[PDB]
């Protein structure tokens, strides 16, 4: 479609620190790609982000019932919605699937890769460590970083650059809040 | 220092006359409101057992967003949106094993306006069995995220494509996937 488009977009953001002890409420307004005005709970009033948000800064700050509503949002809206979903969002725990497989080097390099895939876990906070005969490998460890799957799960690929020698035992160790003791998958040449 | 972030993201677009209302928690959709049906649609069905949402609140907000769009369009001297094309990434839910169920993920990121046509292509042919998708998810800036899914049975024979259509792209973007 060639026809021109006009977009009005709004985000009402609740930022939580130390549970609900410290909250930052952000009422943002966007026109097309431009954020024009916003309400910051720290500021306590509406402020124009650009020139286009100036009539809203003057008008929304004079609307006393609307300004008091925004000032009370940290408790009546932010803290309230945190509690409503707490058991299945904040406290949500999905245990990971740990897969260890050898990989081909791109192209022929001195070292081959040993991939530790950690999938289907929640939350995002995870510790993935590589071991060589009980000793932790700190060098030659390559990670794709944290991959969000968009379905309340995460994944990560933690590679080890090594030469399969001696008859060694390689071990990937996984630590996640969903499990009490670290998870391990052993691999041998 | 930030622990968690809850975002209520809402939009209205002209001339399409289409709106959307959703709640986001740490980048994940909690729920969205079905504008046509006047229904709350939970991302994971267990969410509806512990929490609830009155869909009327979303629709009342959308009427205001529409009115605000009308005002903002006039205020900007009728300036249309500059289309930002998306970055498309195709991946799997877990490592690939032959004949073992897996999920293909199509991640569409950094785009505006929030309008796409996403078709999954198995050997160049469209597939709609088991397909699922998120709504247009919020980002730190003015741009949008979206996830599309295709549950599949891995084979050496079968090849895959995610065809994404956006007004910022001159040609429909096809991101390919195949075994090894």
């Amino acid at each position: 479609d060639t026809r021109p488009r006009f977009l009005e977009y709004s985000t009402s953001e609740c930022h939580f620190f130390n549970g609900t002890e410290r909250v930052r409420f952000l009422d943002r307004y966007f026109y097309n790609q431009e954020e024009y005005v916003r309400f910051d709970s720290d500021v306590g009033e509406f402020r124009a982000v650009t020139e286009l948000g100036r009539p809203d800064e003057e008008y929304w700050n004079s609307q006393k019932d609307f300004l008091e509503d925004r000032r009370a949002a940290v408790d009546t809206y932010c803290r309230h919605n945190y509690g409503v979903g707490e058991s299945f969002t904040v406290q949500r725990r999905v245990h990971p699937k740990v897969t260890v497989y050898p990989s081909k080097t791109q192209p022929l390099q001195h070292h081959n890769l040993l991939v530790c895939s950690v999938s289907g876990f929640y939350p995002g906070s995870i510790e993935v460590r590589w071991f060589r005969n009980g000793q932790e490998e700190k060098t030659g460890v390559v990670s794709t970083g944290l991959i969000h799957n968009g379905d309340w799960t995460f994944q990560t690929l933690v590679m080890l650059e090594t030469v399969p020698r001696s008859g060694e035992v390689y071990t990937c160790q996984v630590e996640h809040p969903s499990v009490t003791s670290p998870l391990t998958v052993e691999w041998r040449a | 220092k930030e622990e968690h972030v809850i975002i209520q993201a809402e939009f209205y677009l002209n001339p399409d006359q289409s709106g959307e209302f959703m709640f986001d928690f740490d980048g994940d959709e909690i729920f969205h409101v079905d504008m046509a049906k006047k229904e709350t649609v939970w991302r994971l069905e267990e969410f509806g057992r512990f929490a609830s949402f009155e869909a009327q609140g979303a629709l009342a907000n959308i009427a205001v967003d529409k009115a605000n769009l009308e005002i903002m369009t006039k205020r900007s001297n009728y300036t249309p949106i500059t289309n930002v094309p998306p970055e498309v990434t195709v991946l799997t839910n877990s490592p690939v094993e032959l004949r073992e169920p897996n999920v293909l993920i199509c991640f569409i990121d950094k785009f505006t306006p929030p309008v796409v046509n996403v078709t999954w292509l198995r050997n160049g042919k469209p597939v709609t069995t088991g397909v699922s998708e998120t709504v247009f998810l919020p980002r730190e800036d003015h741009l949008f995220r979206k996830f599309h899914y295709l549950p599949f049975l891995p084979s050496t024979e079968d090849v895959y494509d995610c065809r994404v259509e956006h007004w910022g792209l001159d040609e429909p973007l096809l991101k390919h996937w195949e075994f090894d």
Binding site: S10, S12, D27, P55, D56, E58, Y59, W60, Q63, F66, D69, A73, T76, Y77, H80, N81, V84, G85 | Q8, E10, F23, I30, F31, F50, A51, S52, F53, E54, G57, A58, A60, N61, V64, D65, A67, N68, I71, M72
Partner: peptide, 16 residues
């Protein structure tokens, strides 16, 4: 016990 998510109500912009 309120197990309901609350909507942050929208207000009409300035027509000036």
């Amino acid at each position: 016990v309120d197990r309901f998510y609350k909507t942050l109500r929208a207000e009409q912009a300035s027509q000036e």
